[model samples]
Structure formats: C-alpha cells, structure tokens
Target: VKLTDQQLMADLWYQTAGEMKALYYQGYNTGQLKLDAALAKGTEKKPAIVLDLDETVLDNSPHQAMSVKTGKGYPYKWDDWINKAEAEALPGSIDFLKYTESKGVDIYYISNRKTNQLDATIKNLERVGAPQATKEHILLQDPKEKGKEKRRELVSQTHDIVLFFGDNLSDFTGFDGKSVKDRNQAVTDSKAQFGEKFIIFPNPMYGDWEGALYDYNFKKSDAEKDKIRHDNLKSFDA
Candidate 1:
C-alpha cells in the first residue's frame, strides 16, 4: 500500500527539504514584524494573535510520513499521534509566539482538532514551550459546529485579534465548504490581508484545497480522485 509518487514527494519535501524550514521561518519572521507594528499602533480591544495548530505552529510531518509508509490516510492512527503529543514546534514559531506573550498580547490557537483531544494538545504545546496554551486560549472543534468562524468570533468578542496564522484558507475566514472558484475568488478579494493580518504557512500534505478539487466529494475511489487531480492540472502544449 505504497503512496503515489506525488504523495511520496510531498512527504519527502516536507520532511527533508530545507525549503520547508525556510518557509516556516519566513512566515514567522513576517509575523513578528507585523506584531511589533501592531503593538506600536495599539488596538481598542485586548490585542490577540490567533493561529492554527497543525502545520502552522506544529510539525505533524511524521504522521504524514506514516501514511507514506503504511498507506493509511487520515484518521487512521491519527488519534494515536495526537495523544502521543510528540510533534515538534515549527522553525521560528516559538520565538514569535513568545514575543507576543512578552509584549502582553494574548495568543490563541484555533484548530480543527476534536475537542476531546484538548488535554494532549495542550500538553504538546506546553511541551514545546508555546505561550499561553491554556484551556481558554486553545479552541478545538466541537462536533456541533461546522467550521472555525464561531470560534474566531468568540475571540473577537473580547480581543481585537490583530493577526491570524494557519496553513489553510479556512483558518483566516469563512472559506470552508466553498467551491474552488469561490475560494480562489475570496483569496483574490481579500488580497490585502496576506502577511498583514493573515500569515499563512504551506501545507502540501493536505487541506480543504484538495477537497475542492474533488468538488468536496472524498468518498470517491482512489482512481476517481487521481483522475480529477490529473484533469485539474494545467499543462503546456509541447
């Protein structure tokens, strides 16, 4: 049950490529500069930073590597990985988060991980020395809610939420459950927010972007998915 060539390459690059670490560093470097400016400018509400957990702040590439080795897609032994709480902090993430903490700006992690995994998640964040990994600051997905919009709003109630960080479009706004066209259009429309208010990291392993390619239908056979992915690719005539 070996993964496809492309899948193998994605995991390989994530795990081995110096470019991956460089990108993480680049994202946090930009974030730190923005945080400094926002601190100087000041906000009416308590200034806070919101970030998604998985690839944005934590390196979960080992889980993806497991898939490459065993051909087990997501949710297979995923809980085991989460419960282990062994994921490493991404490059520069700790420094930026600590900088926010030192400046007295609140830090909140809004992630799609299930609410039940909160304890282990917090343990992992604390293990890696992430600032403010408390219960109130870490918002996990509840079964009743669909996306993170409500969670973001919850933070907005008290905190100004000056910046957002994640590897997914949904992390910054309501891009969840959107068609490919709508998502692309939304990114285009919100073009000004990037690096200013939204610091997005790279996640070639998985995201809603892949689901959009299948028209949000993931139950299709592997062959079907392969076809859709191939069809969606743009190629130049030789």
Candidate 2:
C-alpha cells in the first residue's frame, strides 16, 4: 500500500520531533548571522525582515494530518484548518522571531492566506509566542494583490527590508509562470543575495518547489503529479 502525499508529509513532520527542530534551528542561525551583519549597517531607520507565515514560521502539519487520516482530502481542508487558529510555531521560529524582534528589526509576516483569515492567522501566530502585530505586521492576499512583490514593495517603502525568509523561492520574487530552468536561472542571477539577505526554511511537505516538478501546470491528476515527482528521484544502486 502506498501513502498519499499528505500522509507521507504529515508523518514526516509529526514523527520527527528532533530532526525538524534541528533543521529549523540551523536555518534560524544562518538568518541570525545575516541579520546581524545587516543590522550593523543601519541607523535609526526601521529595518525589517519579512518572513512567510506557513512552514516558515508556523507549523501546519497537524492540519494535514486530518485529511491523511480520513484517506479522502479536498481543498476545503485548508479552509477548515485555517479557521481553527490551531497551528503552532515551527521548531525554532519563536526564538528566532524573538531574536529578530530584539535586534529592533520589524518582523513582518507575508502569507498567501486569504484576507478573511487575517484575524485567525494573527491569533494563531501570537498563540505560539511570535511577535509583531495581529494585523499591522501581516500582509495577507487580497483581491487585487498579484503576488508578494507588491506586499514586499509596500514594506520597503516604509522600512529597509534587510532580509526575507521563506520556504519557497517565489517568496522572494514572482514566479512569472516560468519553467524550472528559467527559475533556476533567477536563483543563479541572485546568487550573492541568498545567504546574505534571503534566508529560506526547509519544507519538504509542499509548496512551489513541488509545483515546479510538474512545471507548475497544477491541473494534472494526483497520479500524474506523483509520477512526475517520482521520476525526478535520484535512485540508489542496489
């Protein structure tokens, strides 16, 4: 019997109590070094670090668990999960956010979560001892928002964006509906910016990284998507 994608992801997260924490701590430490260097260059100007909400700061693995357990999942699972305000902080996110906040960096959470879910998102973020605001510091997706570029631009207008932290490459720039090759080139072009000001967290569960494997079509069936994902695997010699 094969596990569904959600089952595999959820199990990997909830089961690895220590490994995930170490990885989160590792990511956060890299962030700390970058941010410290950045902080050394600023004055009274408000320096901010934008972090993605889900997977970056908050853990949504439990939400995935419900669908995995039922053996039948749908998009509504996300809607149902978001409204509950039940997510906890990703492993080292609280301490890292607190450290960033303590360094006088304005912490901002930019997420693709719907605008209607703002209150719930804020509450759940705060529940885990995360700083920033219930509303002011968070930028949610609105009807007119194309992608996070505008949200990030808005923050930049008022503050110096010293760093960006997220699990997805798209978190830093628009996907532009480009192919994997084009996307990889973008990373190559911005090679210097990665460790210096763009910190990323590990998220094997799901995101644009997985989407890119399918060339971002998103219309393919689960079997098709699974095959694409599987075919990309680097198999070991028996």
Q: Model 2 over residues 93-158: C-alpha lDDT tens digits?
A: 888889998887898899989899998997888788889856899999997676688889899888
Per-residue error (Å), model 2, residue 55: 0.3
Among all windows of ten consecutive residues in candidate 2, which has the lowest summed lDDT?
A: 1-10
Off by over 4 Å in 1: 1-5
lDDT of each: 0.90, 0.79
Q: Write the per-residue lDDT of candidate 1 for residues 157-212, one digit (tens) a residue.
A: 99999999999999998588898899999999999999999998888988899989
Model 1 misses residue 228 by how many Å?
1.1
Residue 20 shift from truth in candidate 1, angstroms: 1.2
RMSD of each: 1.4, 2.7
User: Which predicted model would earn the best TM-score?
Assistant: 1
